[PDB]
């Protein structure tokens, strides 16, 4: 059966090379590159007393939630730097957080293998754990709400899961990864999502049927970050081999490679600008770089973090970038 | 500011105050990463003192946090950076493992990885040698050659245990990191005293290094 699997893999390789007419670099040799995309730290969010592992913007592009090792989930008013909530976590070992698209819920998880859904908008004025989603047998590396009731989580047990939060039960389990799934990104329409794992492969998952539509293998090392292009027909992955790759869903192969000879450190987080021409990747060299996602040119740099930039996100209105880091600060960039 | 913005700022300042108080309280906690290899004597010392087991207890005006993380049956490097700020690693090694296939060679490889990890350059290790009584029962009959063909030493209990322990300190290869080995028989209710002594020595050595006196 291994022979048949290898034959099918070779057939997929031949099909991918068949569709490789002109590389993204050849078709974007004539577009005018943006010279130096220079964001500047507008707000610095202080109040985390440990390394920050995750942050997630609100859909209102003003509130953001940050997860840190000090056992606190803090909701920030990024405009005024006001702390809207400070949620004490039962497990301090949180390495992911998600903010519900409605804003009524926030999720967190990590080494406790449990996704904790927090009801922000309660009749009481406190934030309480509405639902603890247990069932993953590894640490949760990412979680992403589809809506108030559906959340997709990725775990170190090599499986992504879809949860019905009201019942607390896994609606679907997305098996097929061989290494620890490290990140998720839902499509803008949230009908399907990509997940990067330690097997250096990003898989495209259909939410309803639970079937892996496509598998993308371009990286040499552990994929730490993944993010759809704004139109949902492509995505970008960030792996430990210091390179980002732009895979197309329809083309089913990498289109562009975002690597620089000065960069040898791994990539913790990636995100796109609202138009998608910028690919903001957070690196282990303590700063975030900005990439011309169409020309692979390093458009700019986001320096200002004294430790590894573990997470970064762009507002749904594309106005600002928040980059958390292990130095316990979130900086808002414009 | 508006009246509502003023009250929101007041709430934010209250949140900041509570965060600072919680950080002050958490800074007084001595964080220990409790490791081991499969069937090692981790559970015995756990009783003496899901995905991660966190144990809080106070000993001699010191509040310890034991992070038992062996249940994480995945790649360690994907979660070992969470414990970058641990005071020490309480490594458990079953002495009665040289005769079981190899268990203790896997423990030695894990110990080498823990010592040479980029996040544990200056993080001390409180090595515990577990089940030393069964090791003594098994060491008189079977010699210490299955685990160490290069042993070439006396078949005695003390020499065999010292050889295993010394092979363990051999992986330290660091000036700012020390290994505080102890021998345990699973029937001694003073292992937390050994952990406390090791942690006290760790704090004293860190303070001396800050003073330039170490």
């Amino acid at each position, epitope marked *: 059966l291994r022979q048949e699997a290898e034959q099918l893999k070779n057939q997929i390789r031949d099909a991918r090379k068949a569709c490789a007419d002109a590389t993204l670099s050849q078709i974007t040799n004539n577009i005018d590159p943006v010279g130096r995309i220079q964001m500047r730290t507008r707000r610095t969010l202080r109040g985390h007393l440990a390394k920050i592992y995750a942050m997630h913007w609100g859909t209102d592009s003003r509130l953001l939630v940050s997860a840190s090792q000090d056992g606190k989930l803090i909701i920030w008013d990024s405009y005024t730097t006001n702390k809207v909530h400070a949620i004490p976590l039962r497990s301090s070992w949180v390495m992911t957080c998600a903010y519900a698209p409605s804003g009524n819920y926030v999720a967190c998880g990590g080494l406790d293998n449990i996704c904790s859904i927090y009801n922000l908008k309660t009749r009481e004025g406190n934030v309480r754990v509405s639902r603890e989603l247990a069932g993953h047998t590894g640490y949760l590396s990412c979680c992403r709400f589809l809506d108030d009731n559906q959340i997709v989580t990725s775990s170190g047990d090599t499986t992504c899961a879809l949860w019905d939060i009201e019942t607390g039960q896994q609606t679907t389990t997305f098996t097929g990864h061989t290494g620890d799934v490290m990140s998720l990104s839902l499509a803008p329409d949230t009908r399907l999502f990509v997940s990067g794992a330690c097997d250096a492969s990003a898989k495209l998952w259909d939410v309803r049927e639970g079937m892996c539509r496509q598998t993308f293998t371009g990286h040499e090392s552990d994929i730490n970050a993944i993010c759809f292009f704004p139109n949902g027909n492509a995505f970008a992955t960030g792996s430990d081999d210091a390179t980002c790759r732009l895979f197309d869903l329809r083309a089913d192969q990498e289109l562009m490679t975002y690597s620089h000879d000065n960069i040898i450190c791994g990539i913790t987080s990636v995100s796109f600008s609202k138009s998608g021409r910028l690919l903001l990747a957070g690196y282990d060299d303590f700063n975030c770089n900005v990439w011309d996602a169409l020309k692979a040119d390093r458009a700019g740099v986001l320096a200002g973090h004294d430790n590894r930039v573990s997470c970064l996100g762009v507002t749904d209105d594309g106005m600002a970038v928040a980059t958390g880091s292990w130095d316990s600060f979130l900086k808002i960039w414009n | 500011l*508006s009246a509502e913005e003023r009250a*929101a700022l007041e709430r934010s300042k209250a949140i900041e105050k509570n965060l600072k108080e919680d950080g002050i309280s958490a800074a007084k906690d001595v964080k220990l990463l409790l490791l081991g290899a499969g069937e090692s004597g981790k559970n015995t010392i756990v009783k003496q003192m899901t995905g991660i087991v966190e144990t809080h207890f106070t000993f001699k005006n010191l509040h310890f946090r034991l992070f038992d993380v062996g249940a994480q049956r995945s790649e360690r490097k994907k979660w070992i950076h969470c414990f970058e700020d641990v005071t020490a690693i309480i490594f458990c090694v079953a002495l009665s493992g040289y005769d079981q296939v190899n268990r203790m060679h896997a423990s030695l490889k894990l110990f080498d990885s823990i010592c040479n990890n980029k996040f544990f350059i200056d993080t001390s290790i409180i090595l515990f040698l577990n089940k030393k009584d069964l090791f003594g029962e098994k060491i008189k009959k079977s010699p210490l050659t299955i685990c160490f063909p290069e042993y070439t030493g006396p078949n005695t209990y003390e020499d065999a245990a010292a050889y295993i322990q010394a092979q363990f300190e051999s992986k330290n290869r660091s000036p700012n990191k020390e290994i505080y080995c102890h021998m345990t028989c699973s029937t001694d209710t003073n292992n937390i005293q050994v952990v406390f002594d090791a942690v006290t020595d760790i704090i004293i050595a860190n303070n001396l290094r800050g003073c330039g006196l170490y």
Partner: single-chain antibody
Amino acid sequence: VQLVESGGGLVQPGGSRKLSCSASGFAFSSFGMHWVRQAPEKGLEWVAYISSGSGTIYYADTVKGRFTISRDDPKNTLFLQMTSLRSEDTAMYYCVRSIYYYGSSPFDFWGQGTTLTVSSSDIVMTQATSSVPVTPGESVSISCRSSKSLLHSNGNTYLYWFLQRPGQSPQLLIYRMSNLASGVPDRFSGSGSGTAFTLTISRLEAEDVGVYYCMQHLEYPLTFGAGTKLEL
């Protein structure tokens, strides 16, 4: 969630009493609590405010000095220390639950109120309409006027709408102008700009009969408009 006021009763003029609020069912420590009184025939009138943790306190300019608002978080009790009780201090005193952050809904829960009987620059909120006849099933608009623009430099308009249903304490309808309160059916709608506002009800029910109050929360001496009663 319930707020129970105790005390009130009958007091001689110039006397003194303490009003108590036995808050229960919610995280009382995190709420800025108000005292809002309503004269036996008049409309609501905000009395005092003690923030979360007692850090910030305001009083109505007509009760300042005579009244003292205090809270007891461990026992979740809110106090109004009333002294020199003039004849104009007779009213039903409502304790009001209010929490302030981004997106919060202040004034959302009102205590049932306690009756006090005493023997014998501020923004002006105007409700020119009052006691308007309405019929079930038809749309009605309740208007409001403000002396100062309630819209702030941040883009937020601090206009509140409450419903003094007959025999029931006020219940929030729209907390910031055009922001429906929790549990309020989506037929009430708020709109306006600057100083002029309107509360629109799509298909008014039999439960929509009551008295509708404005409130500004821009400058802190919070002022209500004289209620615009709805009757069949």
